[PDB]
Design a protein around this nucleic acid. Structure first.
Lengths: 84, 65, 47
RNA sequence: AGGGCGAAGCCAGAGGAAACUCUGGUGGAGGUCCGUAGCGGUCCUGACGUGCAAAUCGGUCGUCCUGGGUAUAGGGG
RNA sequence: CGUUGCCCUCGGCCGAUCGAAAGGGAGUCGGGUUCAGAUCCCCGAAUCCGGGGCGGAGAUGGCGCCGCGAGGCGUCCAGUGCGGUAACGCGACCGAUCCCGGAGAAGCCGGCGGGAGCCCCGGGGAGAGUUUCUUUUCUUUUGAAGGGCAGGGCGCCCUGGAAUGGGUUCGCCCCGAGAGAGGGGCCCGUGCCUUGGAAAGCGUCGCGGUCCGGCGGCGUCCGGUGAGCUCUCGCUGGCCCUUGAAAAUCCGGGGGAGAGGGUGUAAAUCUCGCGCCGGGCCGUACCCAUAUCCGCAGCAGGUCUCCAAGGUGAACAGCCUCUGGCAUGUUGGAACAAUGUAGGUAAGGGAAGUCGGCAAGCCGGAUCCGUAACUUCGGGAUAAGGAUUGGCUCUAAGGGCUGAGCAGCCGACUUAGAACUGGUGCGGACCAGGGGAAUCCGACUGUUUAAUUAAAACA
RNA sequence: AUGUGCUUGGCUGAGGAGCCAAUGGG
């Protein structure tokens, strides 16, 4: 009934090429087009509701926004950022 | 191929002179025992792991996938 | 689709389309200088 | 290919004293029509005319057949 | 059963033989592999034809001594299967010469329906592209054979009996020689499930690089729609003074000569399930056509086929694109004179040109109106003539599943009527009939001098 | 001037910008 996705970002954060402070999604994730407490974000890695590929699309949009050399790929309900 | 529905029929098939091998296939849901005979390959499907082990124990004296 | 006889004819015609051995030019009474060569496009077989 | 016209048969409705007529639909005929592929070859008396080619090319046109096997041989077919 | 002559015995003519790499003709598929071969090699799973095992089938049954034993003996008699009212069914279920039949074995066209491949729509993953916007845009997401079950078909069976005739198709059709209704049977099942079979394949992310069908993780998921295209399977029509092969080969039936054994089996298996052995010979590369064939050539010619996606659109039209392919067709550079070949435009006039409106320019699609003379009554006819056509925002109508009429969920495209709106532009490219009034000839459709005559000639 | 508008079909995810249709059409 509850869908969870992680979308880890350890590698670019550790190298300091980008901070995990601007990414944590709240202002861009669309629910029913435009959604209350229906979905939630648990920043740490991030985390709850939905399409995972929507998260991949938003992550690539963020990478293009910050000129980020990086690749969104890791396990079910989990995306990872890794270098080429 | 032929599909055997009973354990005794499988045991009778596996004791045939023309039987060459038996191969065990552990699937997520079930286990399959396949006996290579002259004309047809015979498959038995077992959904119980304990019954599968018991059948594996009682086989003719003469490989797992 | 070939017959056995046609294929044998073609094989014989193939084995004849080679240059002369060079050492034949060293013989005592040799008048040959090169090979009855046939090209598949320039000349057609008798068929 | 795709389209047009739309025969016979069939259904219903309307008019009429009757006989019967009319209207709508359905149907899908034709050595039918427009027109692909195919087949052909009208005109430009166009191109070319020591050509791409010992007869081909382009527009414009007519209509909408073809492989293999087999038979007929020269005053013969 | 390899043995000779004879009868008790039968055995007709389509008389030998040849004639199809598109006709007939049993039986092989999936994956992998090469520099070049694979339905042929390897891995795996099958199958057809031909030639002395095991199991099952033939099938354990019916006076009377003991026995209420279901005990065996004693004797005699049966037994070349059984089930269903039926259609028919079940693993098999004797049988010759002979006879009957079936399949092989049948045209063209129309309409409709089922199944599949492709295309399309809405989501879920994996990778990729773009990054003001876009939960976005692209790619990708189970063989043969066997066994079940769908769904397709049936002039197949049983009950029963029909008019107030009913059932029914897009059309038709059907019925006291039996409808409707109910219950069954058979055939096809290329569709789904399952063995095959995930172990292989594919996608993506990683790890061992010497080799490596190398080792691994994850995934290979849900639906919807159709006058859509292609293939196929059916059903039902139409046309013919046209009626649309033969044989090999295979099978069923009728009949009954015969064989089998005596009470435990024997003969025999439409030949039932397994098991054993074999399938020789020849072809197989590649091109298959703006350079692998023929045309003297790497020749703008000719030369038989199969598959074929998106958009527009009626469309296998034309135009643009994707998969796949290519390098502009025996070269390149500079310049842009005349003459040329192939295209475009031209004020005013509008055939005055010319043998002749030659060619080329007017018309052109759809929708709504309208349509003469004449006629063989079919036509002529898109006659002629007129109006409209874009974009955008709406309205109305047109279906399927849920409990003379009310509420939800699903669903593909049209048609009509409006408002607004553009420098009147809108079949904007592409595609795409100029028309009318007459004479002559040939009725028409068809054919004809390959390479100067397509005609009024021929038929 | 292929100069600048307009416009059909298609294509570059859309837009802004453009390209293709042997000079797309005007």
């Amino acid at each position: 009934q509850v869908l969870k996705f992680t979308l880890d970002c350890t590698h670019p954060v550790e190298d300091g090429i980008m901070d995990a402070a601007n990414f944590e999604l709240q202002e861009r994730i669309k629910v029913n087009g435009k959604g209350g407490g229906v979905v939630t974000i648990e920043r740490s890695k991030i985390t709850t509701s939905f399409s995972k590929r929507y998260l991949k699309y938003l992550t690539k949009k963020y990478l293009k926004k910050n000129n980020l050399w990086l690749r969104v790929v890791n396990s079910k309900e989990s995306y990872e950022l890794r270098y080429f | 191929p032929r599909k055997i529905e009973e354990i005794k029929d499988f045991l009778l098939t596996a004791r045939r002179k023309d039987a060459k091998s038996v191969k065990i296939k552990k699937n997520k849901d079930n286990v399959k025992f396949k006996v290579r005979c002259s004309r047809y390959l015979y498959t038995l499907v077992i959904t119980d792991k304990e019954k599968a082990e018991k059948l594996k124990q009682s086989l003719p004296p003469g490989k797992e996938l | 689709h070939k017959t056995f006889r046609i294929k044998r004819f073609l094989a014989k015609k193939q084995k004849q389309n080679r240059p002369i051995p060079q050492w034949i030019r060293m013989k005592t009474g040799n008048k040959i200088r090169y090979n009855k060569r046939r090209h598949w496009r320039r000349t057609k077989l008798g068929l």
